[PDB]
């Protein structure tokens, strides 16, 4: 029972924190059903029910203290799901269903248990590759996921706080990507999405009836982006869009407020042969005025004046690697001291240098997966020199930029990662949102400290094992 657990220190990164003691002085609150009935013989498995009751008390913070109900519903608390799954599994009437103590320790030794904060299962519908994040720090915390099952588009609005969503077909043609622009000075928060027919709707989240259509482009829309030139500069924000005819059109965040708004500038970087796929911003502040994008087999970097600064050709990549993989458009681009490149239907990642315009390294996800199809799908990078890799097989790879080593491989939670990107919720914390297949769509929210948590847990468990072995040997001696 919680009365029989002693605490030595409150510092989370400690060798010894909690201890067990039998005070020498079962109870109705925490009686195991086999023991409560009493027609049973003591078994190792009997204590597992008490341990699960302890877990429930910890999750509820002693709410039961002052057939059990749902931990989230009965008392307000963070979901923190796989522990709830552990409680459901262990708290089973059948004794054989109770996991062994070693199994409980092993499943409790997973850092994913700590990192996984929330998991949402969208109801049966077309999976959403579209994903947006909310800039609002109030109770309004939601995403703008969108799916298309017919010619006309459709959008969804799913609030994380309320765990509910509303979906309705609003766009006359399918949506493929979205962007969000925020102007708190004018209190204008707008969401723009592009039709496969070749027009765009901008919609106000404050009033759903503010729906107006932009000018038309020749071919469908590939990607959108909303660029902020830092919060300490007087430069005006711009809505960048990239189409399939190489048209890089720029909408002004104040121009789009009126119906029938004309794009101010257009760059014809590519064509149908090499359509533009994605955009990205430089992580370092030294190149924040330089914006990069993968125009098919081309990489363009342009300054705030919308003039190209550097061009890189991907056709030099197959000289070392396989030709068929290299002969494809680049899908994701990550801009840092070294460019990280992933291209369509490829299991390898290329490293470019912004100075020499030459290959600097190769990341072979095939070998990493074989260590435990392998096509990479999406990328994201953070400040602490840790890179997250989304695979087409439903796996997530963690690497460190310091050594290009494998940190952890995450699986058994989705069938195929579509998109994955960083976000901030209403409590100002930073988390990672991952969307995968299961076809059912599953959304997972991971703690941003996942690599640090993995390293800390590994070091702590190694220290505990070493101390236990040393003291056991001392006792035997």
């Amino acid at each position: 029972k919680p009365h029989n657990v002693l605490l030595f220190t409150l510092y989370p990164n400690a060798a010894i924190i909690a201890k067990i003691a039998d005070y020498g002085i079962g109870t109705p609150g925490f009686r195991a059903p086999e023991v409560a009935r009493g027609n049973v013989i003591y078994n190792q498995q009997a204590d597992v029910y008490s341990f699960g009751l302890l877990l429930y008390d910890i999750l509820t913070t002693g709410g039961r203290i002052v057939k059990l109900p749902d931990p989230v519903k009965e008392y307000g608390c963070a979901p923190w799901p796989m522990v709830e799954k552990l409680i459901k599994q262990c708290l089973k009437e059948n004794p054989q269903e109770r996991p062994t103590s070693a199994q409980v320790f092993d499943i409790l030794n997973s850092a994913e248990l700590v990192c996984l904060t929330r998991r949402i299962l969208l109801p049966k519908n077309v999976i959403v590759e579209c994903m947006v994040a909310t800039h609002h720090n109030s109770r309004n915390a939601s995403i703008w996921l969108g799916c298309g099952h017919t010619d006309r588009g459709q959008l969804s609005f799913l609030d994380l706080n309320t765990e509910g969503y509303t979906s309705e077909e609003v766009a006359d043609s399918r949506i493929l990507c979205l962007a969000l622009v925020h102007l708190p000075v004018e209190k204008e928060s707008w969401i723009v999405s592009g039709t496969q027919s070749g027009t765009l709707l901008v919609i106000n989240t404050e009033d759903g009836k503010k729906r107006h259509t932009l000018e038309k482009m020749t071919d469908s829309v590939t990607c959108l982006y909303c660029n902020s030139f830092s919060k300490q500069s007087k430069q005006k924000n711009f809505l960048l869009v990239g189409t399939a005819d190489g048209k890089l059109a720029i909408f002004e965040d104040k121009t789009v407020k009126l119906k029938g708004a004309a794009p101010l500038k257009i760059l014809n970087i590519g064509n149908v042969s090499t359509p533009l796929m994605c955009l990205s911003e430089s992580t370092n502040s030294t190149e924040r005025n330089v914006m990069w994008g993968g125009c098919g087999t081309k990489i363009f970097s342009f300054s705030n004046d919308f003039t190209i600064q550097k061009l890189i050709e991907t056709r030099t990549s197959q000289l070392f690697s396989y030709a068929a993989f290299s002969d494809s458009n680049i899908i994701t681009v990550v801009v840092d001291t070294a460019l990280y490149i992933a291209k369509q239907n490829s299991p390898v990642v290329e490293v470019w240098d912004k100075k020499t315009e030459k290959l600097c390294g190769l990341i072979d996800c095939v070998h990493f997966l074989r260590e435990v199809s392998g096509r990479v799908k999406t990328l994201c990078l953070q400040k602490n020199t840790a890179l997250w890799i989304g695979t087409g097989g439903g796996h997530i790879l963690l690497l460190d930029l310091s050594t290009r080593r494998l940190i952890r491989v995450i699986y058994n939670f989705c069938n195929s990662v579509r998109v994955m990107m960083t976000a901030q919720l209403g409590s100002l914390k930073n988390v990672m949102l991952v969307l995968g297949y299961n076809i059912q769509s599953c959304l997972t929210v991971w703690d941003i400290n996942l690599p640090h948590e993995v390293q800390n847990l590994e070091k702590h468990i190694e220290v505990r094992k070493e101390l236990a072995e040393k003291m056991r040997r001392t006792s035997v001696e």
Binding site: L10, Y11, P12, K383, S402, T403, R404, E462, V463
Partner: protein, 361 residues
């Protein structure tokens, strides 16, 4: 004296096939002539394949000058050849003097010079001695005995058990060291008991810099915004220590150097190729530190502006006698103050002057 021109004739004949011993002869000459003969000692090919004196003579000749461009590259090629002949050469090599010359040449501005082939040979030798990781631990111990934080990072990155040995951290902290070195050792894994012993050591030899470096690892949790200095038996307390523990938002992030990580990356590649071939701190626990006064907290060094946002101050199980009044007015946002199990004699009435005090004990 004729041995100089004799070695010239020797260099002429070594190009002929089947030159075979002449190794003992040239070794005696090199021990006799330090400067001129060593300039042409590059002619030493694979001969004799076990005398440690020969290897000792080789390394001592390299180090005795250590400032002539050509003999360094020549001698590095020579030592590379003989280790390819026998891997047991690496053991005796790192045993006698290998560190004293290797660290000196790689830290004497080896970067920013058009010596790409030179560095390549040195990294090839590095990847060669990187095997038998016990030797790497020896290299780490010797690299910590001296104050060279430039290469310790490389040894840690290649993989070295920093908890090998009086552990490493206590040794580094005992002698006068640099903040960069102790930081690199704390960032890599090192046993908590070793770090605790190192804190006691650095308390003895008073140095605010190393004290803060350690306390940022033992007693700081950024998630909770709390200092957890509970039970460390720090007999005193100084504001110059808790300074860098508080966020101090003026500070930023800057990559001072990257030469060590790139050096580590290329030696790893060569080894692989050779194998293939706001948010202030709202708590301050000082409980059970065997204090005797906290008078040293007055117009503190950058700690005064941070104490104004403290919302808890655990001072229990110490042995105090008063509460400094200047601290009472500085702590303008406390709510939970703990003073139990101290040694007080009269209630300081001015404690009740704090602007927001709400739980006095």
């Amino acid at each position: 004296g004729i041995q100089k021109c004799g070695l010239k004739v020797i260099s002429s004949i070594v190009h002929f096939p089947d030159a075979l011993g002449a190794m003992d002869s040239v070794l005696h000459t090199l021990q006799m002539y330090p400067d001129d003969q060593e300039i042409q000692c590059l002619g030493l090919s694979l001969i004799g394949y076990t005398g440690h004196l020969l290897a000792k003579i080789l390394v001592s000749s390299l180090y005795r000058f250590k400032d002539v461009a050509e003999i360094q590259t020549k001698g590095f090629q020579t030592i590379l050849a003989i280790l390819k002949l026998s891997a047991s050469f690496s053991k005796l090599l790192v045993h006698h003097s290998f560190d004293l010359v290797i660290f000196h040449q790689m830290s004497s501005n080896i970067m920013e010079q058009k010596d790409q082939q030179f560095l390549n040979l040195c990294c090839k030798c590095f990847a060669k001695v990187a095997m038998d990781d016990y030797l790497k631990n020896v290299m780490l111990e010797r690299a910590c005995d001296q104050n060279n934080s430039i290469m310790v990072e490389c040894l840690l990155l290649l993989g070295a058990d920093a908890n090998q040995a009086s552990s490493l951290i206590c040794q580094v902290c005992e002698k006068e060291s640099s903040p960069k070195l102790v930081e690199l050792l704390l960032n890599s894994g090192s046993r908590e008991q070793d770090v605790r012993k190192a804190l006691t050591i650095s308390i003895g030899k008073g140095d605010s810099q190393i004290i803060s470096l350690l306390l940022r690892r033992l007693a700081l949790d950024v998630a909770n915004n709390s200092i957890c200095l509970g039970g460390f038996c720090i007999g005193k307390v100084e504001p110059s220590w808790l300074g860098p523990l508080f966020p101090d938002k003026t500070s930023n992030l800057r990559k001072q150097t990257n030469i060590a990580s790139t050096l580590a990356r290329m030696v790893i590649r060569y080894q692989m190729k050779s194998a293939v071939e706001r948010e202030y701190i709202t708590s301050l626990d000082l409980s059970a530190n065997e204090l005797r006064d906290i008078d040293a907290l007055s117009q503190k060094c950058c700690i005064s502006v941070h104490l104004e946002h403290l919302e808890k101050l655990e001072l229990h199980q110490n042995a105090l006698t008063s509460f400094p009044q200047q601290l009472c007015e500085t702590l303008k946002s406390l709510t939970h103050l703990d003073l139990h199990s101290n040694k007080f004699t009269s209630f300081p009435s001015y404690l009740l002057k704090m602007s927001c005090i709400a739980n006095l004990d």
